[PDB]
Structure 1
């Protein structure tokens, strides 16, 4: 089932989400399936559960980036190197900005069946994971913009 994506300004995007405690369950598998469908219908490359008003540490992502469902994610930078790049948000439709993110990270958590996930990622892969992770702690990308000249509507931006 395709779910409604809530828009920036909804208080529910500002919450710090609790952990998933139903790994391996039918309930979690159906929510994840819904998230992939939803992300797919909106043409996203990532979607966090708070964006469909589900208060859980859960994201889906991938596109080149392997299709992944990640519960209880933890991230750690693998160096201090930052990189700028374009980001948009399905909860902020039409807009984009340039945002600095760690170029290199490791992320860990669990697949929806309960098996552990732990990966090194770089570049766009790493950026997507950082972006979704931010949702789980009630943070959106405008609060990370450094250069406001880059923030604007997709169809008009020239930077």
Structure 2
């Protein structure tokens, strides 16, 4: 039974994540986050609040073959440049896509799953994904940046998806 991904609204998506002090204690959760990620059709990033957990942990795999896990423990965006709009979705706001401003160049510091420091500097699509996933750990969803109308539309779409039966 892989962990289920929560959908908005759910108060667990809005909790501030807590720093991990004991990396050895969160190995199960890391493996479970990866299993949940990989059980999705097209998921490329998953943050712990999306499965209802408060630990500051993100997992990402941007590879075509889905065999390139990136685990970020206690991630932070340390700097960034080159703001651009780009379309995002989120497994926790299913079926709704919209353009969001992000830094297209970023530096993130985190620990890897073994607890070793990691510094990732990137101007690729990874930059966008990390910012999106790290935002979850602050209790933020990408729709939060959108006009009120768009936010309303997003919530209505999620509800349709959640309530629908016939596919």
Q: Same fold (TM over 0.5)?
A: yes
Unmatched segments (≥5 aa) in structure 2? 158-167
1:57-68 equivalence runs, <5 A: 57-63=56-62, 66-68=68-70
User: Residue 118 of structure 2 aligns to a residue in which SS?
Assistant: strand
Q: Deviations over 1:89-137 (max 9, x none)?
A: 1011111111110011100110121111101011311000000011000
Counterparts of 1:70-85 in structure 2, within 5 Å, are 70-79=72-81, 81-85=82-86
> Does the residue aligned with 1:19 lie in a helix, a strand or coil?
coil
* CA apart distance, 1:67: 2.3
Aligned to 2:165: none
TM-score by length of 2: 0.81
Distance 1:64 1:3 in 2: 22
Aligned to 2:50: 51
Q: Using the TM superposition, give the Cα deviation of residue 148 of structure 1 relative to its aligned residue in structure 2, in angstroms.
A: 6.6
Give the structure 2 partner of residue 40 of structure 1. Answer: 38
- TM-score, with normalisation over the residues of structure 1? 0.85
**Within 5 A, what are the aligned runs for 1:131-146?**
131-145=132-146
Deviation at 1:64?
A: 5.2
Tell me the residue number matched to 1:98.
Answer: 99
Verify the 8 A CA contact 1:109 1:116 in the aligned structure 2: yes
Paired with 1:28 and 1:138, the residues of 2 have a C-alpha distance of 20
Deviations 1:15-64 (A, max 9, x none): 111101221x1x41211111111011113100000000001110000225
Contact 1:98 1:147 in 2 (8 A): no
Distance 1:83 1:148 in 2: 21
